[PDB]
Amino acid sequence: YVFDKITDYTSSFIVHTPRKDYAPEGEKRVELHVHSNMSTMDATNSISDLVAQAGKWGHRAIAITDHGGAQAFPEAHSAGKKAGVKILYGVEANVVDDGVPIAYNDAHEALSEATYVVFAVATTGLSAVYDTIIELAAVKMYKGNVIESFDEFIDPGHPLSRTTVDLTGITDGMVRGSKSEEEVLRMFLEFSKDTILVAHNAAFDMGFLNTSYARYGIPEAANPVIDTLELARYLYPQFKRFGLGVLSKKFGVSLEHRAIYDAEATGHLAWIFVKEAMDNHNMLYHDQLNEHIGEGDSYKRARPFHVTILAKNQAGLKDLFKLISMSNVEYFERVPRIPRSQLKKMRENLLIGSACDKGEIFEAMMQKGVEEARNRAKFYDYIEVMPKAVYAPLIEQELVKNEHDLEEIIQNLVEIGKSLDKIVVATGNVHYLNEEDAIYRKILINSMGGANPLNRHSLPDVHFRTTDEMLTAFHFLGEETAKEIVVENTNKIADICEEVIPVKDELYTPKIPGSEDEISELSYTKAKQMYGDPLPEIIQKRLKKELNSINGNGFSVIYLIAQKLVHKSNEDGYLVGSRGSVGSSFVATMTGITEVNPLAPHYYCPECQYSEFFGTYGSGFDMPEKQCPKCGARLNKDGHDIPFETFLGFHGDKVPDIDLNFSGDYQAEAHNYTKVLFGEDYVYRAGTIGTVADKTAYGYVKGYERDNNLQFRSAEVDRLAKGATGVKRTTGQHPGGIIVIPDYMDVYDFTPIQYPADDQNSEWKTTHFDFHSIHDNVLKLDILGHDDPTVIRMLQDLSGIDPQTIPTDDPEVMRIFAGPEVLGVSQEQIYSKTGTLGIPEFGTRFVRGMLEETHPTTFAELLQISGLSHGTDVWLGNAEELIRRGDATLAEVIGCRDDIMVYLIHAGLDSGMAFKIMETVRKGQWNKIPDELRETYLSAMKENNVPDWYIDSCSKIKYMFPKAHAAAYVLMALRVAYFKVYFPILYYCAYFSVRADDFDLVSMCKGKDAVKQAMKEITDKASVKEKNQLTVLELANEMLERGFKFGMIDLYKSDAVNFVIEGDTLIAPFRAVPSLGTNVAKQIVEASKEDLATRGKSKTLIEYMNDNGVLKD
Ligand SMILES: [Mg+2]
Ligand SMILES: [Zn+2]
Ligand SMILES: [Zn+2]
Ligand SMILES: [Zn+2]
Ligand SMILES: [Zn+2]
């Protein structure tokens, strides 16, 4: 089979009828237990392909039930709508019994004075139903002292398996000659009279005893019982391990596992436990031992079991989301846990199921008996019986002795269900699609090793089974029973559930009263202040069209939130930049959200509010410095000719998207204000599902071959890797996204919630679903963090210059981009043609060579450089050769999509056609577009006399950067350049303190020679770290060549993270010193050489300073 590379399903190399459901059309099964790749590191197939498979097999419904999550619900919805297959939305939850009693036969005896027969049993196994006691020990204890002892051996007819001979120190001879049970049971019944039975895991030992009793018609002997396991859990929740040995060790009790020892050990503890129960609490009787049960962290110590929960109706889906959210947020231990009481409250619209062999019913039937399974099954709505293979690992694990006993377990479960009038269904616990895939799942598990108990044994065959396979597998039950539990009951369960929709259809934005009016008032107030009450026609038309598009579509909330966030940012003294197309909005400019002005190049008078508008000038900043005609003030200039259609789309029917680069420091404050704005219960950090990628998958595959010692063709490694790829590995938060839920709706109408990476200490909750499926229905606010706003603010603190006052039309920043002669350093010295090292977006070697080659000296030319840099194929094979060959200037070449549109409309082409042409070129689809469309575009361009090179340039373009983000980058660059060109020490301090994280401090402090040698090493090389060090070292060499110097870290002159300035030397932060740490840095700031070492706690860092000359000081 060609998987890229041809696979025979046996091996791989480097140079078919699909599975069919043969059942009749109406007699197809419904698969009710499906695990997708959203079950963390458990299943490997996407829900989409499972749903597609089901749609080819004619099943009328399928159920998605992942392990503790619903993260495959949106993809499942899409797949079910494509395949015409009904989706039942469920989860495989880990449910913990809320209340597990400590005392079993409630009685009003006094614990301090009662007689305890602390007993124990050696066994042939764990299943009281299919294995028997091989020994019986007990110690009658009083007042904490032993009174009597009863130890006996019981001989099973079969020889003891080597497992028992080892687990239990009992051999066949050891019990070769022993009394019959009937007799040993009667002896223990008389011995255990008028006493309080005691056991560790008293459920296990009481079930065995009662089963043995019932084997001879002996009375059940229901005297009061105590389970030391539960008592220890309740009394010492602090412990995380409660096994006898562990507990015996903790409380200093000695044990080798022979029943006699076990018994004496439990007794030596049980005395302590009962004393603690009587003293530390008010439990002086047996009954009082059960009063406080299932209260508190009880969920944390309980052992979860698998349950299947299916949403009955849309209310049921909301309830499943609330249960998933609570299991993630309130009842999480090493897994999302649902207390059984919570599942009972919310079950009117939930069909609860018995799940798999890890369920309560299968566990009870295989280890406790039909009556316990019949009582537990009372709580479920349907019973799940899987084909024997799924239960095959149990036989290999020796839980079920043979195929005869396993057939007895499945048949009993079918009967118990008919008896209680419950739907019994065959499910399949599907974890993969076809059987060739099994190895896919096996290669994924092996990676976890001892973490996954599934490794201890072999994995089952959990593959989607056709209807006939399931029917044939359960045929062992009978003919009118297999067809019932496979086809009829499953379809009955499917018909019970009403159609559910997990994802909404429209966008639900928050409501702020007076938002449209507020946005209009802000925009018009700013416009009047900048251009006068008799507003110019151009600005009038722009504002009217923008505001009609915004307020008309109900998007004023997006702009209003953006405005409040940016205003608060300004009040704290932080500039907010933007990413995307928000700068294309003049309402965004006037409301203060953006600093880019999308208007046409224009002059405006600061005092008269006069105005003149112009495509002769590419941008207003690139215009003569004229003086106001009306008065003597220097006319201000602005405008970058950015249409709003790029942001609000043609016709303005598009949802505004405002990504704001707030400072890295202030992002927390911004998110907290988004909470204040909408409430702590309606804002959630966005969520991302980190999965396994091919590098990791290849690693896991190679690890399997090494561990199992099997060679694979390299191509087989490749095929196996492409198959373990896409499996959920973890969950994360988006870098700065926040999702807001309308106060007239709750999060559960959209998604469950959780903590990122399941960290319960997280200050924010994330959405359970991907932001990629909830962002078309609720507002996703991108409050991103960027280092640029952190640099400008510190430069303002260091210099006082208000950032806005800085002029971006300076006549020396163009010089910075032409050459370093403005800086006062030679190209030979700074090792770069342009003195733009460290100017945001203008210091990468590639972009620096682009500048050296084209020598731009205008704001429009700098925008073209930024576009050439963030566009694929727009330059290396496009405008780099059109410029070197001399065909076109830097200004003429295509650099941004908005530039494409403006030029096509600067020429006679109609605006609508250009928008279409701009979109086509932006999406790298010009080649893809059919000749009819390409011909319309070509004819229009030629009629407007479009230069022939332009069309050729368009054909090779892939992705083109937006013009507004480019203008933001260029403004930040020009402000940081003002300081670099005018106030160098301040610029250098800000850059290092905010961006530089890796300093070869000793080399930088030594002088130029050292930095030069260090750069050579990197030049000869290299790891990401080496190149980061090389960028910091290059800025260091520029600063050193400029006469400024660095200083060694000073105990009384070094800030923890920020460089300090004295003359032309920046004192260095403690953070820079190799691994001086950040917490250690803060501690030093808070504060003999030994005394300093103490405040810091590291001897190794003390040795560093002792060698670099601070400790010498
Ligand atoms: Mg025991
Ligand atoms: Zn699983
Ligand atoms: Zn399960
Ligand atoms: Zn399962
Ligand atoms: Zn004027």
UniProtKB/TrEMBL annotation:
Coiled-coil annotated spans: none
GO biological process annotation, one example: DNA-templated DNA replication
UniProt key word Nucleotidyltransferase: yes
Subcellular location as annotated: Cytoplasm
Domain Polymerase/histidinol phosphatase N-terminal stretches: 30-97
Catalytic function, reaction form: DNA(n) + a 2'-deoxyribonucleoside 5'-triphosphate = DNA(n+1) + diphosphate
GO molecular function: 3'-5' exonuclease activity; DNA binding; DNA-directed DNA polymerase activity
Keywords carried by this UniProt record: Cytoplasm, DNA replication, DNA-directed DNA polymerase, Exonuclease, Hydrolase, Nuclease, Nucleotidyltransferase, Transferase
Domain called Exonuclease: residue spans: 115-279
Enzyme class: transferase
A GO term from the CC aspect: cytoplasm
Major location category of this protein: cytoplasm
EC number: 2.7.7.7
Protein role: Required for replicative DNA synthesis. This DNA polymerase also exhibits 3' to 5' exonuclease activity.
The protein's name in its UniProt record: DNA polymerase III PolC-type
Organism lineage: Bacteria, Bacillati, Bacillota, Bacilli, Lactobacillales
Range of the intact protein held here: 247 to 1437 of 1450
